[PDB]
Design a protein around this motif. Structure first.
Motif, PDB file in Angstrom:
ATOM      1  N   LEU A 274       0.696  -1.371  -0.006  1.00  0.00           N
ATOM      2  CA  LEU A 274      -0.078  -0.002  -0.094  1.00  0.00           C
ATOM      3  C   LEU A 274       0.869   1.345  -0.074  1.00  0.00           C
ATOM      4  O   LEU A 274       0.545   2.148  -0.582  1.00  0.00           O
ATOM      5  N   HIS A 275       2.045   1.134   0.773  1.00  0.00           N
ATOM      6  CA  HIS A 275       3.029   2.419   0.750  1.00  0.00           C
ATOM      7  C   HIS A 275       3.602   2.600  -0.643  1.00  0.00           C
ATOM      8  O   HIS A 275       4.199   3.409  -0.733  1.00  0.00           O
ATOM      9  N   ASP A 276       3.700   1.464  -1.363  1.00  0.00           N
ATOM     10  CA  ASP A 276       4.185   1.443  -3.054  1.00  0.00           C
ATOM     11  C   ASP A 276       3.228   2.103  -3.728  1.00  0.00           C
ATOM     12  O   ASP A 276       3.690   2.789  -4.566  1.00  0.00           O
ATOM     13  N   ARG A 277       1.756   1.944  -3.918  1.00  0.00           N
ATOM     14  CA  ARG A 277       0.868   2.612  -4.562  1.00  0.00           C
ATOM     15  C   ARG A 277       0.924   3.850  -4.171  1.00  0.00           C
ATOM     16  O   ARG A 277       0.636   4.624  -5.200  1.00  0.00           O
ATOM     17  N   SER A 278       1.131   4.363  -3.124  1.00  0.00           N
ATOM     18  CA  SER A 278       0.735   5.816  -2.526  1.00  0.00           C
ATOM     19  C   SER A 278       1.832   6.547  -3.012  1.00  0.00           C
ATOM     20  O   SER A 278       1.808   7.866  -2.828  1.00  0.00           O
ATOM     21  N   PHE A 279       2.922   5.907  -3.750  1.00  0.00           N
ATOM     22  CA  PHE A 279       3.768   6.889  -4.369  1.00  0.00           C
ATOM     23  C   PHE A 279       3.427   6.775  -6.142  1.00  0.00           C
ATOM     24  O   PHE A 279       3.837   7.576  -6.728  1.00  0.00           O
ATOM     25  N   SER A 280       3.126   5.432  -6.376  1.00  0.00           N
ATOM     26  CA  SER A 280       2.962   5.241  -7.875  1.00  0.00           C
ATOM     27  C   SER A 280       1.854   6.393  -8.301  1.00  0.00           C
ATOM     28  O   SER A 280       1.762   6.371  -9.512  1.00  0.00           O
ATOM     29  N   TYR A 281       1.269   6.858  -7.389  1.00  0.00           N
ATOM     30  CA  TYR A 281       0.275   7.856  -7.938  1.00  0.00           C
ATOM     31  C   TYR A 281       0.992   8.905  -6.812  1.00  0.00           C
ATOM     32  O   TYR A 281       1.206   8.708  -5.747  1.00  0.00           O
ATOM     33  N   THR A 282       1.539  10.405  -7.651  1.00  0.00           N
ATOM     34  CA  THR A 282       1.768  11.438  -6.656  1.00  0.00           C
ATOM     35  C   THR A 282       1.191  12.827  -7.355  1.00  0.00           C
ATOM     36  O   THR A 282       1.440  13.889  -6.656  1.00  0.00           O
ATOM     37  N   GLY A 283       0.953  12.659  -8.413  1.00  0.00           N
ATOM     38  CA  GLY A 283       0.132  13.695  -9.236  1.00  0.00           C
ATOM     39  C   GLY A 283      -1.311  13.719  -9.532  1.00  0.00           C
ATOM     40  O   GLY A 283      -1.754  14.847 -10.029  1.00  0.00           O
ATOM     41  N   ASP A 284      -1.778  12.659  -9.296  1.00  0.00           N
ATOM     42  CA  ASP A 284      -3.285  12.540  -9.451  1.00  0.00           C
ATOM     43  C   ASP A 284      -4.072  13.336  -8.584  1.00  0.00           C
ATOM     44  O   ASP A 284      -5.234  13.861  -9.102  1.00  0.00           O
ATOM     45  N   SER A 285      -3.729  13.054  -7.361  1.00  0.00           N
ATOM     46  CA  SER A 285      -4.671  13.971  -6.361  1.00  0.00           C
ATOM     47  C   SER A 285      -6.058  13.617  -6.376  1.00  0.00           C
ATOM     48  O   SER A 285      -6.769  14.126  -5.465  1.00  0.00           O
ATOM     49  N   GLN A 286      -6.297  12.278  -6.886  1.00  0.00           N
ATOM     50  CA  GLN A 286      -7.787  11.817  -6.945  1.00  0.00           C
ATOM     51  C   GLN A 286      -7.423  10.466  -6.406  1.00  0.00           C
ATOM     52  O   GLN A 286      -8.215   9.910  -5.362  1.00  0.00           O
ATOM     53  N   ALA A 287      -6.417   9.850  -7.129  1.00  0.00           N
ATOM     54  CA  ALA A 287      -6.303   8.214  -6.903  1.00  0.00           C
ATOM     55  C   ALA A 287      -5.148   8.080  -5.902  1.00  0.00           C
ATOM     56  O   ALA A 287      -4.477   7.185  -5.647  1.00  0.00           O
ATOM     57  N   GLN A 288      -4.780   9.205  -5.154  1.00  0.00           N
ATOM     58  CA  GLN A 288      -3.730   9.209  -3.958  1.00  0.00           C
ATOM     59  C   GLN A 288      -4.598   9.421  -2.842  1.00  0.00           C
ATOM     60  O   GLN A 288      -4.908   8.277  -2.034  1.00  0.00           O
ATOM     61  N   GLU A 289      -5.615  10.332  -2.792  1.00  0.00           N
ATOM     62  CA  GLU A 289      -6.248  10.609  -1.444  1.00  0.00           C
ATOM     63  C   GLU A 289      -6.854   8.998  -0.985  1.00  0.00           C
ATOM     64  O   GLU A 289      -7.143   8.837   0.024  1.00  0.00           O
ATOM     65  N   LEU A 290      -7.586   8.387  -2.327  1.00  0.00           N
ATOM     66  CA  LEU A 290      -8.392   6.957  -1.887  1.00  0.00           C
ATOM     67  C   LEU A 290      -6.905   5.913  -1.430  1.00  0.00           C
ATOM     68  O   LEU A 290      -7.312   5.483  -0.518  1.00  0.00           O
ATOM     69  N   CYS A 291      -5.770   6.045  -2.137  1.00  0.00           N
ATOM     70  CA  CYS A 291      -4.842   4.994  -1.581  1.00  0.00           C
ATOM     71  C   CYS A 291      -4.407   5.561  -0.246  1.00  0.00           C
ATOM     72  O   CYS A 291      -3.976   4.738   0.647  1.00  0.00           O
ATOM     73  N   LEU A 292      -4.159   6.819   0.162  1.00  0.00           N
ATOM     74  CA  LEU A 292      -3.648   7.384   1.303  1.00  0.00           C
ATOM     75  C   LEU A 292      -4.707   7.225   2.455  1.00  0.00           C
ATOM     76  O   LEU A 292      -4.371   7.503   3.515  1.00  0.00           O
ATOM     77  N   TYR A 293      -5.949   6.932   2.003  1.00  0.00           N
ATOM     78  CA  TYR A 293      -7.042   6.492   3.175  1.00  0.00           C
ATOM     79  C   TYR A 293      -6.918   5.360   3.560  1.00  0.00           C
ATOM     80  O   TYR A 293      -7.206   4.796   4.690  1.00  0.00           O
ATOM     81  N   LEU A 294      -6.910   4.373   2.435  1.00  0.00           N
ATOM     82  CA  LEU A 294      -6.498   2.926   2.639  1.00  0.00           C
ATOM     83  C   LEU A 294      -5.214   2.551   3.601  1.00  0.00           C
ATOM     84  O   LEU A 294      -5.588   1.623   4.338  1.00  0.00           O
ATOM     85  N   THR A 295      -4.158   3.211   3.307  1.00  0.00           N
ATOM     86  CA  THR A 295      -3.157   3.321   4.145  1.00  0.00           C
ATOM     87  C   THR A 295      -3.095   3.657   5.660  1.00  0.00           C
ATOM     88  O   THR A 295      -2.969   2.808   6.477  1.00  0.00           O
ATOM     89  N   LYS A 296      -3.880   4.971   5.837  1.00  0.00           N
ATOM     90  CA  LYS A 296      -3.936   5.210   7.171  1.00  0.00           C
ATOM     91  C   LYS A 296      -5.126   4.282   7.886  1.00  0.00           C
ATOM     92  O   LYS A 296      -4.864   4.318   9.183  1.00  0.00           O
ATOM     93  N   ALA A 297      -6.073   3.711   7.083  1.00  0.00           N
ATOM     94  CA  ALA A 297      -6.926   2.747   7.752  1.00  0.00           C
ATOM     95  C   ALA A 297      -6.326   1.616   8.151  1.00  0.00           C
ATOM     96  O   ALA A 297      -6.698   0.963   8.996  1.00  0.00           O
ATOM     97  N   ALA A 298      -5.398   1.073   7.034  1.00  0.00           N
ATOM     98  CA  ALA A 298      -4.949  -0.361   7.173  1.00  0.00           C
ATOM     99  C   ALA A 298      -4.041  -0.392   8.452  1.00  0.00           C
ATOM    100  O   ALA A 298      -3.902  -1.417   9.140  1.00  0.00           O
ATOM    101  N   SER A 299      -3.200   0.859   8.758  1.00  0.00           N
ATOM    102  CA  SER A 299      -2.300   0.760   9.583  1.00  0.00           C
ATOM    103  C   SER A 299      -2.731   1.255  10.839  1.00  0.00           C
ATOM    104  O   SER A 299      -1.983   2.275  11.405  1.00  0.00           O
ATOM    105  N   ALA A 300      -3.932   1.024  11.448  1.00  0.00           N
ATOM    106  CA  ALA A 300      -4.361   1.260  12.840  1.00  0.00           C
ATOM    107  C   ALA A 300      -4.133   0.020  13.573  1.00  0.00           C
ATOM    108  O   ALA A 300      -3.345   0.193  14.659  1.00  0.00           O
ATOM    109  N   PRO A 301      -4.262  -1.175  13.137  1.00  0.00           N
ATOM    110  CA  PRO A 301      -3.869  -2.340  13.984  1.00  0.00           C
ATOM    111  C   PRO A 301      -2.517  -2.453  14.198  1.00  0.00           C
ATOM    112  O   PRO A 301      -2.039  -2.833  15.455  1.00  0.00           O
ATOM    113  N   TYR A 302      -1.686  -2.235  13.156  1.00  0.00           N
ATOM    114  CA  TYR A 302      -0.077  -2.411  13.275  1.00  0.00           C
ATOM    115  C   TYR A 302       0.287  -1.570  14.247  1.00  0.00           C
ATOM    116  O   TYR A 302       1.279  -1.754  15.160  1.00  0.00           O
TER     117      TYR A 302
END
Lengths: 129, 60
Positions: free
Chosen positions: A101-129
């Protein structure tokens, strides 16, 4: 034209299978919360079909208009299909699924639509860890 | 994206470009005392044309 619209349908049949299968207890505890937050974005996708459906009753809907209406969902649902197939392709459970997930969050850095989605999936997934 | 990479190697940061893009193309293999002399070529081919050569040689 229908084939042109069918990929969102193919990119939908392959997310809901992920949300159920990786919702078993066996898959760690971050693979859990990943699917469970990919559930706020299937809510969005169902309601747009529903409200569009109420529009078709009054005969004010056209095949071209539909194709134009579903553009945003051709994309959000598609990013969720790559994330699902990639977690599945290399068995990802635990710290590995929090790296992909931290890889896809860079594979997009200019779209600003398909980052907020990946960057929400990452902040959500990393609460248990 | 071009000006994304140029807001960390211009303040505090590192060249992350899985596929080569940002003009500074640092050299691995050398973590020795030889870097303030020899670790950072300015890849001339990827300096975007809206930047003169004289601006591109202060970021590095």
């Amino acid at each position: 034209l229908v084939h042109r619209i069918l990929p969102v349908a193919a990119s939908y049949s392959a997310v809901t299978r992920f949300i159920e299968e990786k919702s078993s207890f066996e898959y760690g505890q971050v693979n859990h919360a990943l699917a469970a937050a990919m559930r706020t974005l299937v809510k969005e996708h169902l309601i747009l079909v529903s409200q569009l459906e109420q529009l078709h009753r009054q005969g004010l809907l056209s095949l071209q208009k539909l194709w134009f209406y579903i553009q945003p969902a051709m994309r959000t649902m598609d990013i969720l299909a790559s994330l699902a197939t990639s977690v599945d392709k290399g068995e990802c459970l635990g710290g590995s699924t929090l790296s992909l997930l931290h890889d896809r969050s860079f594979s997009y850095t200019g779209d600003s639509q398909a980052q907020e989605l990946c960057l929400y999936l990452t902040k959500a997934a990393s609460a248990p860890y | 994206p071009v000006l994304s990479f140029l807001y960390r190697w211009i303040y505090d940061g590192e060249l992350e470009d899985t596929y080569h893009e940002f003009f500074v193309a640092s050299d691995p293999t050398v973590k020795t005392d030889r870097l303030w002399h020899d670790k950072y070529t300015l890849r001339k081919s990827m300096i975007p044309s809206f930047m003169t050569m004289d601006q591109s040689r202060k970021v590095l």
